[PDB]
């Protein structure tokens, strides 16, 4: 143990300014210069010292009775003072600058060790911590997990960010929750052995072959966001999934999801999807993300009557009206589509977040009773009129209307054109294949504020 044989000032034990100030409060003293006894130090069994700007834990070796510490979000490098604190069972030390965890090697009573967002490469010091049930090492610089092979009580594990070889996990069949996000993994064959997994998070890897997951029927949560998935046939066996994230892949064929009726959250953004008919039976869905795909016909969503969040930005949708049956909808995102008519949104009065920029919207009147809106986007609409004949004098009507139904006068007009409500007129010196105008007006719906704006293109026939 580390002990004092005479009462000693706090700041001669705890040399870090912020830690001495914290210990002054913990030990019930008035000043960091006040003396404490070993009996005072012996009282401290938990220490919550997160995000205080602590650079050193020098002095904590004298808190012999510590069982739980939180030094997360500090500037720690050296953790030598922990080396003999053998009553420690839980350590939270995420978001520091730790590289050397050799001081942890003999802390064999540890059951929980959280070290994500550090500078750890060498995890050999963990190899004898066999009572660990929670070990978090994500956002480090680990390339080798050999040291984990004997941690046969682990239930929750994360690591990163350079691991290629998952073979050291083979005997860790107690694992229930695994996060291998942000490594260099293509081969997940070893995960077939982890039959107790309930949650697998594996984002930002190089996975294409998911056949090893077929036997993991206890999975309720799966994320393979940011991989190389195309054929997702294996997922048809995962009938207990409720929460699935396949975003940022190469998936076109959703048929293997069509029987997964326990799904309530399904994230499919940034894939190759043109047909969502296989989702029409997933009636428990509350959250569906389909941004960054090839969608046009979204009629299958009309059956998904429990939807509360729906994302569709960056598709080719011109008919939003299948959403009219989604009475529970709160969030509706469809920036960068071809929607002109928003009449079908008029009775979706649970909407609190509407993002509809860069569509073809010219008339906001249907939105007037969406009083729960707090976040709103309506800018940068664009549409092209049917062509008219070129001649020096061209006149077209304006039909842009704000939420009140009032016409919105143009903000700018191309080619020196002018406006006399409701007509825009140009005097063109010579043929040009198109003229244009813009509009831009602040709009508030509920508590949400945006710019309603757009560019209207008028093609001219030679």
């Amino acid at each position: 143990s580390a002990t004092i044989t005479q009462d000693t000032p706090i700041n001669q034990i705890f040399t870090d300014t912020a830690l001495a100030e914290k210990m002054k409060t913990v030990l019930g003293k008035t000043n960091v210069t006040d003396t404490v006894s070993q009996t005072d130090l012996d009282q401290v069994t938990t220490l919550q010292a997160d995000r205080l700007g602590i650079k050193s834990i020098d002095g904590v070796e004298y808190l012999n009775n510590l069982t739980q510490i939180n030094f997360s979000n500090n500037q720690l490098t050296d953790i030598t003072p922990l080396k003999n604190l053998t009553k420690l069972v839980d350590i939270l030390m995420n978001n520091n600058q730790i590289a050397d965890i050799t001081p942890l090697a003999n802390l064999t009573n540890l059951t929980g060790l959280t070290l994500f967002n550090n500078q750890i490469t060498d995890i050999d010091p963990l190899k004898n911590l066999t009572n660990l049930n929670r070990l978090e090492l994500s956002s480090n610089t680990i390339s080798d997990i050999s040291a984990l092979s004997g941690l046969t009580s682990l239930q929750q594990l994360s690591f990163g960010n350079q691991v290629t070889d998952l073979k050291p996990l083979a005997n860790l069949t107690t694992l229930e929750r695994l996060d291998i996000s942000s490594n260099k993994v293509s081969d997940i064959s070893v995960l077939a052995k982890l039959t107790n997994l309930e949650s697998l998070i594996a984002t930002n890897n190089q996975i294409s072959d998911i056949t090893p997951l077929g036997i993991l029927t206890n999975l309720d949560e799966l994320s393979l966001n940011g991989n190389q998935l195309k054929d997702i046939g294996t997922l048809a066996s995962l009938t207990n999934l409720t929460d699935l994230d396949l975003a940022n892949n190469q998936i076109s064929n959703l048929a293997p999801l069509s029987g997964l009726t326990k799904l309530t959250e399904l994230k499919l953004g940034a894939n190759q999807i043109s047909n969502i008919s296989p989702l029409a039976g997933l009636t428990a869905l509350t959250n569906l993300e389909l941004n960054e795909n090839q969608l046009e016909d979204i009629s299958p969503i009309s059956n998904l009557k429990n939807l509360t969040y729906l994302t569709l930005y960056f598709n080719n949708i011109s008919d939003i009206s299948p959403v009219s049956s989604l009475t529970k909808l709160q969030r509706l995102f469809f920036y960068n589509n071809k929607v002109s008519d928003v009449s079908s949104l008029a009775n979706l009065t649970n909407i609190n977040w509407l993002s509809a920029g860069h569509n073809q919207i010219s008339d906001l009147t249907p939105l007037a009773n969406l009083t729960r809106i707090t976040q709103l986007g309506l800018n940068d609409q664009a549409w092209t009129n049917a062509p008219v004949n070129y001649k020096a004098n061209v006149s077209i009507p304006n039909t842009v209307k704000n939420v009140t139904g009032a016409l919105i006068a143009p903000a700018t007009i191309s080619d020196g054109g002018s406006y006399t409500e409701p007509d825009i007129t140009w005097n063109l010196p010579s043929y040009t294949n198109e003229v244009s105008y813009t509009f831009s007006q602040p709009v508030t719906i509920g508590k949400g504020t945006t710019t309603f704006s757009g560019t209207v293109t008028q093609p001219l026939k030679a």
Partner: nanobody
Amino acid sequence: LQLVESGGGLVQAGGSLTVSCAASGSAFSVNVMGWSRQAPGKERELVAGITRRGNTYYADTVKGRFTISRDNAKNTLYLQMNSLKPEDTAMYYCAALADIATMGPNDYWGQGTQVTVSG
């Protein structure tokens, strides 16, 4: 997800400046990331957003002048600002976003970096 903005500075109108956003954590690589700005006594404005795939949103105030980019390998977001105007003077902030083109009710914008444009 921890974010730190840098690269703020003073530039004359017409000039270029790049701000950067360094992220710590696995969430950056698979999050929509955005830049917002706030001038004193003015409302926060979403300037730009970018998806992992690389689709972008730009506010009307900056379209054609600003370019948002990401380097997932460096966990860094950039906002390259060209043809800068005095009206671009603000604190610039980065955050992970739920939407490409709007901000949520309570995003984590953290500390920011000051950009000042002189006339």
